[PDB]
């Protein structure tokens, strides 16, 4: 789990975000990696490091792999699989003038496969959204930052009443009671399918976060993006039953997606 910084070569800065700067590099001069330099005070570092091996054990081809951490210096580095096309949210917005509708369904299948694997381990993602998915050089979408919100220090992001909480991806039981489960990841997946089929538009864009939480509590839901067929919309809408126990599992969604692909 501990990577020696001597084996890393840094090659290009890719960007910066909430948890720090990301660079593309090589491990032992040969293997592509992404390196995130964790922003001081953003994470519970000791707790993350003791559990980095847990996340390293979650190996599925549609999860962005965590390769290890460098912790004998400041800042700590988190080393992962390199995803050359970057965030899914930005990639969807760039796809707007060049795509086949068939590719949108294959992106949903990729994310669903990763989430069926996490569900099989009873591992909660807690912030599934297009901004937390990445895209590789072959256009395969993979899920990233799985479970990370448990280690974030800023209550503005982790509390349901924080200005930065992912209200637009959350079901009623999370907004009201902070009750997370595999079924709150199912709700967020349906919003992510809506983001894919809307080519990266913001969900509930006419509403503030406070108005969105009221809108969802009143039973109102996202309408059908024009690119989604009625069979595709039926799948995303199934993720949004008010009662969590009425929402499907990721194994059922995957079979439904594969049925639409087949037909
Ligand atoms: C699998 O990782 C985890 C799993 C569980 C967990 F709890 C935490 C982590 C974690 O912290 N990973 C650190 C990390 C996250 C994202 C990128 C990354 N980001 N980006 C872009 C948006 C940009 F712009 F930031 F560069 C890539 N292309 C990236 C790329 N990998 O090519 C790089 C490293």
UniProtKB/Swiss-Prot annotation:
A motif (CAV1-binding) lies at residues 187-194. The active site is at 127 (proton acceptor). Dasatinib binds at residues 80-83. It is found in: Cytoplasm; Cell membrane; Nucleus; Membrane raft. Changing residue 127 to H: In XLA; severe. ATP binds at residues 14-22, 36. Clofedanol binds at residues 80-83, 148. Non-receptor tyrosine kinase indispensable for B lymphocyte development, differentiation and signaling. Binding of antigen to the B-cell antigen receptor (BCR) triggers signaling that ultimately leads to B-cell activation. After BCR engagement and activation at the plasma membrane, phosphorylates PLCG2 at several sites, igniting the downstream signaling pathway through calcium mobilization, followed by activation of the protein kinase C (PKC) family members. PLCG2 phosphorylation is performed in close cooperation with the adapter protein B-cell linker protein BLNK. Belongs to the protein kinase superfamily. Tyr protein kinase family. TEC subfamily. This is Tyrosine-protein kinase BTK. It comes from Homo sapiens. The gene is BTK. The chain holds residues 395 to 657 of 659 of the full protein.
């Amino acid at each position: 789990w501990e990577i020696d910084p001597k084996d890393l070569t840094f090659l290009k800065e890719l960007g910066t975000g909430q948890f720090g700067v990301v660079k593309y590099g090589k491990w032992r001069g040969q293997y592509d990696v992404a390196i995130k330099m964790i922003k001081e005070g953003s994470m519970s570092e000791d707790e993350f490091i003791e559990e980095a091996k847990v996340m390293m054990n979650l190996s599925h081809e549609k999860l962005v792999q965590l390769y290890g951490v460098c912790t004998k210096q400041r800042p700590i580095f988190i080393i992962t699989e390199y995803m050359a096309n970057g965030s899914l949210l930005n990639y969807l917005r760039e796809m707007r003038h060049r795509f086949q509708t068939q590719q949108l369904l294959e992106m949903c299948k990729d994310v669903c496969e990763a989430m069926e694997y996490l569900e099989s381990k009873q591992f909660l993602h807690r912030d599934l959204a297009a901004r937390n998915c990445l895209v590789n050089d072959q256009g395969v979408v993979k899920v990233s930052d799985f479970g990370l919100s448990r280690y974030v220090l800023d209550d503005e992001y982790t509390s349901s009443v924080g200005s930065k909480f992912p209200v637009r991806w959350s079901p009623p039981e999370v907004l009201m009671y902070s009750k997370f489960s595999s079924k709150s990841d199912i709700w967020a997946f349906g919003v992510l399918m809506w983001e894919i089929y809307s080519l990266g538009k913001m969900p509930y864009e006419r509403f503030t976060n406070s108005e969105t939480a009221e809108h969802i509590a009143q039973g109102l839901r996202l309408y059908r993006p024009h690119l989604a067929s009625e069979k595709v919309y039926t799948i995303m809408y199934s993720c949004w039953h008010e009662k969590a126990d009425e929402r499907p599992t990721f194994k059922i969604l995957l079979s439904n997606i594969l049925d639409v692909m087949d037909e």
